Amino acid sequence: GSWEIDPKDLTFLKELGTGQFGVVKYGKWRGQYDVAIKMIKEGSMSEDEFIEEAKVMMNLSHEKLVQLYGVCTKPIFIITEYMANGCLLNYLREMRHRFQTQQLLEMCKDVCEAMEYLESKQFLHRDLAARNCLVNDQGVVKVSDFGLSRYVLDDEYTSSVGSKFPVRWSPPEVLMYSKFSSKSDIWAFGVLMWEIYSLGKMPYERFTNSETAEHIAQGLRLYRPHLASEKVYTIMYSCWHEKADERPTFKILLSNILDVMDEE
Numbered sequence: 001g002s003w004e005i006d007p008k009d010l011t012f013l014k015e016l017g018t019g020q021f022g023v024v025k026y027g028k029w030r031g032q033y034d035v036a037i038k039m040i041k042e043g044s045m046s047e048d049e050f051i052e053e054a055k056v057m058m059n060l061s062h063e064k065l066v067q068l069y070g071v072c073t074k075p076i077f078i079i080t081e082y083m084a085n086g087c088l089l090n091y092l093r094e095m096r097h098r099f100q101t102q103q104l105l106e107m108c109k110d111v112c113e114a115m116e117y118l119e120s121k122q123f124l125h126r127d128l129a130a131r132n133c134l135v136n137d138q139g140v141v142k143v144s145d146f147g148l149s150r151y152v153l154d155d156e157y158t159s160s161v162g163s164k165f166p167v168r169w170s171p172p173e174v175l176m177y178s179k180f181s182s183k184s185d186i187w188a189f190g191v192l193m194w195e196i197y198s199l200g201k202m203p204y205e206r207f208t209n210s211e212t213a214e215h216i217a218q219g220l221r222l223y224r225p226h227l228a229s230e231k232v233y234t235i236m237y238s239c240w241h242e243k244a245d246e247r248p249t250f251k252i253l254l255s256n257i258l259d260v261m262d263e264e
């Protein structure tokens with residue numbers, strides 16, 4: 001099929017790590033083109049549902065999305081774009097980079113462009129956070145594994161009380177009522193900007209998940225990272241309005257980030 005990649009066209013070269021579905025490896029497709037290969041461990045994925053949605057994910061084409069090239073469905077494999085510099089979260093925590101804030105702003109812009117595109121397709125990421133962003137050889141950040149949360153069978157990940165749930169990237173109405181929308185992706189983007197300007201600090205670093213959920217339920221918020229200007233903090237803070245309707249769109253966040261870039 002159009003979505004299906006012949007696994008005999010793959011050459012496995014390096015292990016990259018382990019995620020919710022198991023090992024990811026680096027390799028080549030037809031001897032020439034770098035790819036990342038997710039080897040989906042048995043029982044970790046609702047596979048038939050994912051296969052049908054891979055038809056829609058293939059067509060989600062934006063330069064700031066980590067592209068899904070295809071799937072191996074005859075473990076099943078997911079074949080994606082390769083990002084030489086790995087995960088954004090680990091990238092931010094490498095102090096050797098000595099990032100300027102203009103560089104941090106450009107990572108935010110990168111992610112916001114991917115997400116303005118997904119929102120234009122009415123497609124929700126559902127687990128946006130720095131761990132689900134990757135960095136290529138030119139320092140470009142792209143958004144990875146968008147939509148994949150729907151096919152995770154692990155109950156610790158899919159329940160809002162589970163140990164693996166993205167509590168610290170979740171708006172109040174997700175934590176209280178499981179009400180997901182474009183505005184929960186907005187909430188998580190603001191936490192992501194906070195992670196970037198915090199150089200990979202855990203949000204609510206001194207709190208448990210349970211204490212975070214009570215905190216944000218009482219109206220309390222993350223506060224300004226040392227490297228965020230007042231204008232940058234205003235942008236991320238706009239994402240955390242208690243009323244989902246009063247949060248910006250990604251088109252509006254993109255205009256604000258572009259505005260501020262004119263100041264560095």
Ligand SMILES: Cc1cc(-c2ccnc(Nc3cnn(C)c3)n2)ccc1CNC(=O)N1CC(OC(C)C)C1
Pocket residue numbers: 016017018019020021022024036038080081082083084085086087127132134144145146148149152
């Ligand atoms: C290990 C790994 C590598 C990659 C990957 C892809 C492309 N390029 C590179 N490059 C690179 C260079 N160095 N390193 C170390 C990596 N890496 C992508 C994901 C993962 C693991 N997460 C995972 O699979 N998840 C599915 C998602 O599910 C939730 C959203 C529900 C989280």
